[PDB]
Amino acid sequence: GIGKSPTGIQGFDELTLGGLPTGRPSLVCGSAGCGKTLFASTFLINGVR
Amino acid sequence: IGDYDLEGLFLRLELAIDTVGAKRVVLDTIESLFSAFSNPAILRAEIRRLFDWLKERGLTTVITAERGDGALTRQGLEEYVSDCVILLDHRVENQISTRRLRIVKYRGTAHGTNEYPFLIDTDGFSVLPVSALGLLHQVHEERIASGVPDLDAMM
Amino acid sequence: GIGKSPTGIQGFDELTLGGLPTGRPSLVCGSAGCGKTLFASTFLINGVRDHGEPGVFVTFEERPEDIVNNVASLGFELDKLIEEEKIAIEHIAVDPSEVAEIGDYDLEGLFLRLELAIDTVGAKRVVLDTIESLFSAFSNPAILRAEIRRLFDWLKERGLTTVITAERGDGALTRQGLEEYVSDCVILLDHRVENQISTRRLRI
Amino acid sequence: AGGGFFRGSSILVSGVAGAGKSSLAAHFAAAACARGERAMYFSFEEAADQAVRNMRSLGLDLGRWRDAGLLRFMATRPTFYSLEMHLAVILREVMRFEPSVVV
Ligand SMILES: Nc1ncnc2c1ncn2[C@@H]1O[C@H](COP(=O)(O)OP(=O)(O)OP(=O)(O)O)[C@@H](O)[C@H]1O
Ligand SMILES: Nc1ncnc2c1ncn2[C@@H]1O[C@H](COP(=O)(O)OP(=O)(O)O)[C@@H](O)[C@H]1O
Ligand SMILES: Nc1ncnc2c1ncn2[C@@H]1O[C@H](COP(=O)(O)OP(=O)(O)O)[C@@H](O)[C@H]1O
Ligand SMILES: [Mg+2]
Ligand SMILES: [Mg+2]
Ligand SMILES: [Mg+2]
Numbered sequence: 270g271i272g273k274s275p276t277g278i279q280g281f282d283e284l285t286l287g288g289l290p291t292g293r294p295s296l297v298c299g300s301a302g303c304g305k306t307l308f309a310s311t312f313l314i315n316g317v318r
Numbered sequence: 319i320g321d322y323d324l325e326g327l328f329l330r331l332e333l334a335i336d337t338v339g340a341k342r343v344v345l346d347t348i349e350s351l352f353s354a355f356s357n358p359a360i361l362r363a364e365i366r367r368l369f370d371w372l373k374e375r376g377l378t379t380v381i382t383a384e385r386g387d388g389a390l391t392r393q394g395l396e397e398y399v400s401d402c403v404i405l406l407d408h409r410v411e412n413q414i415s416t417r418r419l420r421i422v423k424y425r426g427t428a429h430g431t432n433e434y435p436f437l438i439d440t441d442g443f444s445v446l447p448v449s450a451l452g453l454l455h456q457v458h459e460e461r462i463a464s465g466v467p468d469l470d471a472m473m
Numbered sequence: 474g475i476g477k478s479p480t481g482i483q484g485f486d487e488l489t490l491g492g493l494p495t496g497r498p499s500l501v502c503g504s505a506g507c508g509k510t511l512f513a514s515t516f517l518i519n520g521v522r523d524h525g526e527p528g529v530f531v532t533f534e535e536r537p538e539d540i541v542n543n544v545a546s547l548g549f550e551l552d553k554l555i556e557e558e559k560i561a562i563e564h565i566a567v568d569p570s571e572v573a574e575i576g577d578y579d580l581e582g583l584f585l586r587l588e589l590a591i592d593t594v595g596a597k598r599v600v601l602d603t604i605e606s607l608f609s610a611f612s613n614p615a616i617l618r619a620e621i622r623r624l625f626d627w628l629k630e631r632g633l634t635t636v637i638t639a640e641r642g643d644g645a646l647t648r649q650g651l652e653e654y655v656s657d658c659v660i661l662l663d664h665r666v667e668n669q670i671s672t673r674r675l676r677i
Numbered sequence: 678a679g680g681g682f683f684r685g686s687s688i689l690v691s692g693v694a695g696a697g698k699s700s701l702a703a704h705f706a707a708a709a710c711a712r713g714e715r716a717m718y719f720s721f722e723e724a725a726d727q728a729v730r731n732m733r734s735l736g737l738d739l740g741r742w743r744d745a746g747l748l749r750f751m752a753t754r755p756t757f758y759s760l761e762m763h764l765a766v767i768l769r770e771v772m773r774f775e776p777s778v779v780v
Contacts, residue, residue: 270546271427274378278442278444278445279445280436280444280445280446280450281445283450284421284429285421286427290426292373293378293400294369294372294373295400295403295404296391296397296404297380297382297383297404297406298383298384298390298391298396298403298406299384299408300385300386300407301384303408303417304408304417305382305383306382307443308380308382308406308443309344309382312342312344312380313342313344316342316378319569320569357573357610359610360572360573362572362609363567363569363571366606370536394642398505401539403505420671422506423505426542426546427546432669432670433669433671434669449756451754452757453720453723453754455726457726457730672759672760673761
């Protein structure tokens with residue numbers, strides 16, 4: 270189907286069957302301290318590595 | 319509303335991307351810019367403008383949004399414009415707090431739709447979903463002694 | 474009694490005793506990810522495939538390629554149908570200044586365009602997706618209800634089987650709370666979580 | 678009287694753990710296959726190789742019937758799917774194989 274970009278969080282890639290969409294924005298929503306900044310940091314760092 | 323020249327922002331973001339030749343982008347705390355807009359229609363138009371600009375470039379983007387008092391987002395409109403929405407939750411029950419994760423929307427394919435508790439630990443995010451457990455083992459013909467020779471004689 | 478148009482979702486046609494009403498608009502309401510866009514896409518595609526009814530997909534938000542790709546994995550050859558001239562995707566964009574206030578949009582202008590799109594393919598089914606962009610502007614309850622009634626009356630005059638996708642927001646059925654009292658068929662799609670298990674549910 | 682249950686009937690085997698419920702169901706399926714018919718056996722708590730080994734001690738040969746294309750042995754945990762998709766998969770699979778006995 271659509272292309273996907275692996276996040277590096279194995280277990281979220283399995284749930285998403287490959288990762289977040291390639292070429293489209295994604296929204297991570299949460300209250301304070303829920304980890305939605307660590308999610309993006311992990312996305313970037315694992316992508317580069 | 320419209321106080322910020324979004325094209326000005328677009329110019330800058332372009333500069334940043336071409337510095338490193340980026341293929342992934344994170345926009346963190348865009349609430350500062352968009353909390354200003356106070357008419358529902360104008361805000362949705364601006365959010366759509368930004369999302370369309372991001373989609374044109376073919377850049378894999380992650381946008382962090384604050385729940386506030388809403389179900390998913392404070393202003394209640396970004397979740398209807400994106401293609402993938404992921405909700406992170408931290409709930410307290412009987413004085414025990416649990417981190418939970420959920421994929422509310424992901425247009426274009428099938429995915430898990432339940433809530434999956436996860437862990438932020440020394441190495442990062444960890445999700446061990448219970449829906450990935452199958453029943454495909456392998457079987458062996460040896461036997462294991464109990465250390466009680468009488469009990470082993472019963473088998 | 475009244476005529477009905479089969480959707481192709483066997484099991485919803487059985488519940489509706491034939492399908493959605495012929496010649497009247499229908500409202501599919503839900504929150505984000507509830508499937509109210511796949512419902513309309515299925516309506517159009519099954520109509521064109523099983524009954525030879527050309528369809529039009531008017532979108533005020535998404536781009537045609539995005540709509541085509543969002544259903545590729547489901548097996549719908551939407552690109553085929555668009556190539557064969559049996560379905561038309563129409564993008565009616567609105568700029569920030571356009572959507573500022575009540576009556577800002579010339580609904581007759583919209584009516585002219587929608588007519589063009591319909592006569593291109595000789596449509597007999599139509600989907601209006603994300604009409605919230607246009608109608609979130611209106612901020613007086615009476616004026617908004619009058620405009621919604623105007624649009625619904627125009628749709629009903631043509632005798633076009635229409636499906637309108639609406640966003641629940643914080644409401645029981647719709648964000649602004651008025652469209653459900655103007656349409657003839659209202660279908661709510663829901664996705665609730667209990668004990669960490671999510672269930673898709675449907676209701677007429 | 679007559680030699681057993683009626684054909685299209687619904688049969689419930691009940692008991693405590695270790696009672697022999699799985700053994701009786703396997704005997705049903707193995708007989709069905711032995712007469713040349715087709716059987717489907719949906720297990721939700723044991724694996725295919727493990728179930729075959731366990732039934733082998735009771736003298737049944739469920740492997741012969743799997744290798745002969747007359748017994749389909751499907752194993753999936755209750756948490757693998759949602760209640761809707763469990764039903765969907767079961768119905769689809771039953772359709773395709775066209776069994777005579779389903780456990
Ligand atoms: N070769 C054998 N000789 C004598 N008894 C055996 C032999 N093999 C198995 N048994 C008995 O058959 C029993 C099988 O129990 P079985 O699994 O069929 O019941 P059950 O209700 O399905 O239990 P479960 O809770 O695991 O589903 C064993 O407990 C074992 O005591
Ligand atoms: N080294 C760590 N080990 C375990 N948890 C950590 C660690 N570092 C940060 N955390 C978590 O990071 C959380 C903050 O999440 P963060 O993404 O930075 O802010 P926000 O969710 O508001 O965007 C903290 O609540 C903390 O529990
Ligand atoms: N190939 C697929 N298989 C199973 N589910 C799918 C598939 N494609 C899309 N879905 C569902 O489509 C959902 C999105 O619904 P959609 O109608 O496109 O948006 P909305 O409900 O906001 O109008 C996603 O949550 C996803 O679960
Ligand atoms: Mg943060
Ligand atoms: Mg939609
Ligand atoms: Mg058993």
